[PDB]
């Protein structure tokens, strides 16, 4: 009984939103803004006079690189990168709902090409934010459900 998705990824109650964060020019904010723009969401400033508009506040972002596996001499073989993003969605008058995103990536280490590896690491981070943003969007409908059963 498959059928094309007849509903928007972002709930219709969230087609107009306010994007708030302590790092408006950061990479996570840019990724979230791009993801929201791709979904047709209209973004307002924090100082807008319009009420009854839900707000999305981006919290702290944690990026951790650890050793996932080691060689026979104890040197790092694979590096595990974990990105944790916390955010809150304030529905005006109703409540606030916390959401989170966790992204895992792995890459092999090569000291002989350390500089190259560093660039690769940067690329991975640039991708991880994007993934995190997607995850946040995928949690928007659930909040809407939490708004109904309350």
């Amino acid at each position: 009984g498959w059928h094309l998705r007849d509903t928007t990824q972002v709930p219709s109650t969230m087609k107009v939103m306010i994007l708030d964060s302590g790092d408006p020019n950061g990479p996570l904010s840019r990724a979230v803004r791009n993801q929201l723009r791709l979904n047709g969401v209209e973004l307002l400033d924090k100082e807008t006079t319009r009420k009854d508009v839900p707000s999305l506040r981006l919290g702290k972002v944690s990026i951790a690189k650890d050793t996932a596996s080691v060689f026979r001499n104890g040197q790092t073989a694979e590096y595990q990168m974990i990105m944790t993003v916390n955010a809150t969605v304030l529905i005006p008058g109703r409540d606030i709902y916390p959401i989170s995103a966790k992204v895992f990536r792995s890459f092999f280490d090569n000291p002989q090409m350390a500089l190259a590896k560093d660039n690769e690491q940067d690329m991975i981070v640039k991708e991880m934010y994007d993934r995190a943003a997607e995850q946040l969007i995928r949690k928007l409908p659930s909040i809407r459900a939490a708004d109904i059963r309350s």
Binding site: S106, M113, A116, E120
Partner: peptide
């Protein structure tokens, strides 16, 4: 080759437009 290394191809990396970094 100064700063280009082969990139891992996970599911997310399958749609990457680059084979090497740098």
């Amino acid at each position: 080759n100064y700063d280009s290394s082969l990139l891992q191809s996970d599911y997310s990396g399958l749609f990457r437009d680059r084979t090497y970094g740098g």
